[PDB]
Ligand binder design. Structure first.
Ligand code: FAD
Ligand code: FAD
Ligand code: FAD
Ligand code: FAD
Ligand code: FAD
Ligand code: FAD
Ligand code: FAD
Ligand code: FAD
Ligand code: FAD
Lengths: 171, 171, 171, 171, 171, 171, 171, 171, 171
């Protein structure tokens, strides 16, 4: 676990209501990694502004770029030692599973030297769809890790569990 | 057939010249269902304004949301008892077949509890492409229904045929 | 080779730094074909303006349309005798391989009567990703041609090689 | 406590990083009150969009109005049985303590028939300023309730404590 | 009363539904003063356009300035012999009572050589709030005049009463 | 005096014609402090652009933020060792005296660990108003310093006097 | 010197940091001339707003016109008895010296009946450039006056010196 | 004269009140040349819209380009057999005389294979300025023709005279 | 040649089709200098975006400034040890030759301590114009270097030749 203290973590945020709570993960991970940055999708930004998310991490890469210049997928892909997408949408799973990259989050997956760990989150109806399962499987077959969501009173596993999943994957 | 009189129908409209005539289907289906709403893709709206389509149905969900707020896929997906996409583009077929959802129409497919019935419509050159056929097949294997288009002096089957196809699928 | 002098060539440009140099190919191909036009993706235009690219070819079809009217994929797809996408992104490969068409470049592939020849270009990390290779293969299995990039002091083969690849494919 | 199940609760959100987590309070209070609505200040909206906050309550009144029409302070002030401002800024405390109302949140305080319960939240440096304390006192002397923040590893008391404070004040 | 025929009157209009009827006062005062001008707050303008109010007086100073240049508080403050704010909001009372000036109306109070006469108007709930009364008192202690509103089938006293109140104050 | 050479100075500029000459103070103070930054109010910026003021200091914090993100009051408040507002408006005096903070300048006063030194500047009519004097007094009672303006052929004391006043206050 | 008390003075302001202090000259000249107006270049306005400069003179002619109508060079050129450009940029010197007039300031020089007096101000590197000297000379040969800048702890001569230079030139 | 019936004429219009009457020349020249097009400067367009001028000639090239693409100076310069600038401003004379080209009109002069004939028009004060005369001379020395303006109850010579001047120059 | 490895190079890009290929020079010069930055004219940016050019150098100064603030000519002029304009337009030659500076590129020439080396590029018709030659000569007489263009199957000399020309001039 102490091995991460000197690693660069990139968190890709996708469109989900649970993204609004991303600070819980972000603040918890702050003490375990060397540096943490974020890359968001358009839907994620509409839910929670990139400027808001910047109060909980070192830098936020927006799909809209900075001053009209699109951020570099190869630069952020190489910059990061670990790329974790949380939360991941059915869409992002479908795009990455099939080599499609219509936004920076999906593009970065292809440009990151290592495999990507996904933390899916979606409506139960969506979660039980054949394609999603097929997509998840395909990603695994391809080498990516897919932390399953947990049922609750479905959702993401608490920051601590998530941290452990990140550490385990980094092998 | 009289079983539908008490069902909620959601029609997803995609980018096609034939969308301009969607009122023919919409007005014909009005007497057979409890309520009919529409969800459109951006290209469909550029061809025929959502406000225009609203004169032929109960409500139109736009990709652009309402007052800047994106409409809910889980809400419209659950709201509807039957989700029928007419006309369906090669694009929508390719997205749904592979679990990709870059617009509300494709997302709703994943968020609807039941399977979706598709009414493809495209250029003959496009229709004969290997991928399209593979995509259509994959959708069927996945459980979705795909009403084939008919050749004419290719296109969609008249409102009456279409209605029958909807009724048959609802089993 | 002299057979091309009377053929219409459509070049689809995708998002890559190498697109900035597209005039080298465009000007070189000018003497071998009857007429050459271009169709670009949004990212390609942000890198090199459609108006700039218009100084090196007969016409440039933008994703943004002309006067707010989207250009026709069936019209440009049929207009062209040969459709060559250079440079091709992982994204375009992933979209075309799976029958997804979210931009004019990918849509045109489905609307062109013949198969399309692709000239991929991307970061080496991206090039070695499993999905890309799978996508490339799938395109070949589907009938499309995929000119591989070459390593250099990876990139596109010079205009002359490329021309030859176009001629060979036209059979 | 069961007396609240039939009361209308209005929550005024002000500019604070802690506003991003307002769903925790909002969702927790949902089962104890008849209906819950929100009224926000401009700074609060820049941090967390009104549309986001609308996924956790019945309605959100923005400073920007609805379709260009400013929402009514007398209407929302009278509509609500209980008006609770959480989180409250030094600014809102200073405005309300002195009868100044430059935004809907502060105006509503004057237009609500009953007294308002405040849940201050600010930087410790700000919290120890003479004026703030004087303002807090003045509000109390005026009849308003001011739930003090708690020190932690200062902040707002958990949703449950807060609920209790609301119930106690409603007397 | 005939002493006013040669005095310059400045009327500050604040945000209130009763501002819509300001012409009644404005037209009635036209024959008793040398010249009458108006200065409005943003809320007042949203209710009744400055251009509308200009049909009932000699000039209207807007918070938005003229051609992007903010109007001068010292110039309008000195220009006027009598400065009367009707209708006055709880907000304006709170700002002036405490030396705060966030808009031209409140700023002018500080820049006018003489004391200002206020004609408050607000919701009864607001009128009975402790702070308002304290603010009104403070203004009086400071030297300003505050014409109380009258109950009706609360509101402003008719133009004629108001005129008398202006004359009495001018001593 | 040489004690300041290693202190961080923050200058808050408010809306006054005298702000146009702020470079005289800014350039004079440059050799006595470790670093000097500025924070402006909206009115100050309309008079003299933040970009202009940036040619005479190390950084200028605008009310409008940077790239749409509001600057941090706690960050700039803590960053600075000494916070001096010159020129200070009646408005800023009224806001700070009463714990109201509707702009960054006033907010920073509450977020700065130490007391703030004010250099008021306004029209003589405004200066002789009861509220202003009461506000000035209240600020002093609260611990803030208020350098009075001087009459001239009223205004701010020359840069040199001002520097001395800063040094004296820093005790 | 008393001869000027009845003359119209037009001051053209160009792009220079020293323009920010133009009020020193403007206010000093106010008592010696019948009336003083200003005409600015775009760069000068970006440094110090035309509305700001209007507080120190009778009228400011902007390059942007008034309500979209370009101000008249012949009207302002004829209106003025004396046209003095302070500060003058290398650019304005180069334009006027060569009969080029791309902005109102340079155009007015050609439209003014009399010769123009220039008060150059620029970086020392720029001042020592061959072209500038040649341009200055050419202007003199043409009849215009060019008050040289003075070295200091280069810059413009104080308002008083400048006034004298204006008086001397008016012969 | 009949030699022109088969020549392409390009008329460059500059900023002058007399440009408003350009149709008189344009319509008169229509029967003597093969084709007539126009190229305008920004000031000319503000006086008389390019669309207006298009009712009196075959095509109008605007400084603003067409659909955001700047028109080609080499294309229009080569297209035309004769390039005549009427009316010509002091500015255009100064730019062309010195090899400066900040707008399409001046640039075209350099890109036209042949010499350009100018029809100056300006205020008499401007016309008597040394630089203008020097500029006119320089243009002649360079090979360009400069039809002098005539005094009237100064202005341009009637369309007929102008036509003759064009014919004479074409040798 | 190895003397340059520790020098700062500023490249000014002007409006020319050949600017699109500027990366060839930029990338080639990267290994010979300490650092390379670019300053562009408006026309150059319309042809090839500043963000594009930023992928081939350390920084790009735009005429439009950064965040609305114009970049400093004295700062970039002094920053650079060598200032080379490639490609140079007839316009830039005409402006610099005559001491006119209407854009940052031309202004920087005057603000750079040393002489500037120009690499002209234009249409042959333009190149043979008397004024251009006169302008080129004048620049030389003034001390600037002007690398002539070469005829080809006219244009700029390859990056390697250009590098040599830079080295030779640096003496
Ligand atoms: C409140 C809410 C909660 C949701 N929660 C989930 C969830 O938990 N799980 C799930 O699988 N789906 C969820 N969705 C749906 C999901 O957002 C959609 O399927 C979406 O199409 C894909 O989201 P994304 O984040 O993967 O990609 P995105 O890239 O954000 O794509 C979606 C939208 O982005 C726009 N877009 C992309 N790039 C740009 C650009 N450069 N400029 C302008 N627009 C651009 C598209 O036009 C489209 O409308 C939610 C939607 C909403 C509105
Ligand atoms: C007149 C016309 C008729 C056509 N008929 C057919 C047909 O019969 N069959 C067929 O298969 N194809 C047809 N097409 C092509 C099809 O529209 C394209 O393949 C398109 O890319 C996909 O269309 P869609 O409706 O599936 O999806 P869409 O979601 O409409 O995607 C297409 C366009 O939507 C834009 N877009 C998506 N979300 C947003 C957003 N939030 N904001 C802004 N833009 C957004 C994209 O940028 C893109 O240009 C037609 C095109 C035109 C112009
Ligand atoms: C400088 C640079 C160089 C790159 N080089 C490569 C490379 O060599 N190889 C590679 O595989 N990838 C490369 N990429 C990444 C690639 O651009 C991304 O994966 C992109 O998402 C897909 O590009 P595209 O050209 O295939 O499609 P695009 O259709 O251009 O999709 C990408 C962007 O287009 C927007 N978009 C689509 N339609 C519209 C519309 N109608 N209106 C507004 N926005 C629209 C999307 O919202 C999205 O941000 C590069 C990116 C940058 C910034
Ligand atoms: C990330 C962040 C966190 C903060 N956390 C705290 C905190 O915990 N506690 C605290 O006391 N302060 C906090 N502040 C500071 C506080 O936001 C400021 O003092 C602010 O001036 C007052 O906030 P408000 O919510 O009370 O009022 P607001 O009404 O939001 O006033 C602040 C801003 O609103 C603008 N505004 C008001 N009405 C409109 C309108 N109709 N249109 C456009 N703009 C309008 C103003 O111009 C001003 O910039 C924070 C600021 C930031 C940027
Ligand atoms: C229909 C209606 C009727 C009302 N009637 C009363 C009443 O009778 N009595 C009463 O006490 N209150 C009344 N109010 C409420 C009162 O308008 C609010 O308290 C308001 O915040 C203060 O109003 P004002 O006129 O004093 O000041 P204002 O200066 O108008 O302040 C209110 C609004 O002005 C905006 N604002 C200020 N300056 C600018 C600027 N330069 N640019 C853009 N926005 C600016 C603020 O952001 C804020 O939303 C009413 C509100 C409405 C909508
Ligand atoms: C040329 C001139 C000189 C002046 N000189 C003095 C003087 O010497 N002394 C004095 O006491 N008063 C002076 N005033 C008046 C003073 O500017 C007003 O009282 C003002 O309301 C308060 O100024 P401020 O700088 O304290 O605050 P500000 O915060 O600048 O408040 C004033 C204006 O700011 C706007 N504003 C605030 N935040 C935002 C935002 N985020 N977006 C958009 N608008 C916003 C308001 O709507 C309002 O119009 C002057 C006014 C002018 C026009
Ligand atoms: C902070 C600063 C200080 C400077 N100080 C000096 C100095 O002391 N001496 C000196 O010689 N140079 C100085 N310069 C440089 C000088 O501003 C430039 O050479 C400039 O190109 C010419 O300035 P001008 O005032 O003569 O003309 P301007 O007419 O202001 O020309 C410069 C800018 O004006 C724009 N412009 C002109 N008309 C319009 C219009 N109608 N609409 C939109 N834009 C228009 C141009 O596009 C160009 O960017 C300074 C620049 C800056 C940024
Ligand atoms: C009603 C009127 C009549 C006039 N009559 C004459 C006359 O008879 N003779 C004479 O010599 N002068 C005359 N002038 C003055 C002349 O217009 C000015 O000297 C002007 O600066 C040069 O005009 P132009 O047509 O040569 O060039 P222009 O290129 O039109 O230059 C002038 C204006 O163009 C703007 N401009 C240039 N390119 C662009 C662009 N791409 N986008 C936006 N703005 C741009 C500049 O910023 C500047 O304000 C007149 C001016 C007016 C207002
Ligand atoms: C595709 C193309 C290729 C060309 N190739 C050459 C060539 O090889 N050689 C040659 O000598 N000429 C060439 N030209 C012509 C040259 O661009 C024109 O003479 C131009 O007027 C001067 O270009 P510049 O780069 O020197 O200056 P620029 O400063 O770019 O001046 C030209 C344009 O800039 C605008 N402008 C300047 N500052 C601003 C500002 N702040 N905001 C908005 N607009 C501003 C003007 O209004 C004007 O339209 C070409 C033109 C085009 C369209």
């Amino acid at each position: 676990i102490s091995i991460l203290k000197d690693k660069k973590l990139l968190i890709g945020i996708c469109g989900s209501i649970s993204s609004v709570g991303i600070s819980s993960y972000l603040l918890y991970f702050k003490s375990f990694f060397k540096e943490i940055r974020v890359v968001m999708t358009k839907t994620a930004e509409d839910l929670i502004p990139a400027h808001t998310v910047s109060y909980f991490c070192d830098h936020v890469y927006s799909e809209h770029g900075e001053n009209g210049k699109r951020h570099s997928h190869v630069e952020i892909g190489r910059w990061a030692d670990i790329y974790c997408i949380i939360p991941a949408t059915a869409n992002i799973l479908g795009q990455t599973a099939n080599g499609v990259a219509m936004n920076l989050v999906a593009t970065t997956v292809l440009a990151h030297p290592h495999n990507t760990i996904f933390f899916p989150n979606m409506n139960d109806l969506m979660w039980n769809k054949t394609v999603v399962s097929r997509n998840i499987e395909q990603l695994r077959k391809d080498g990516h890790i897919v932390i399953e969501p947990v049922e609750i009173m479905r959702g993401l596993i608490t920051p601590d569990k998530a941290l452990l999943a990140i550490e385990k994957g980094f092998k």
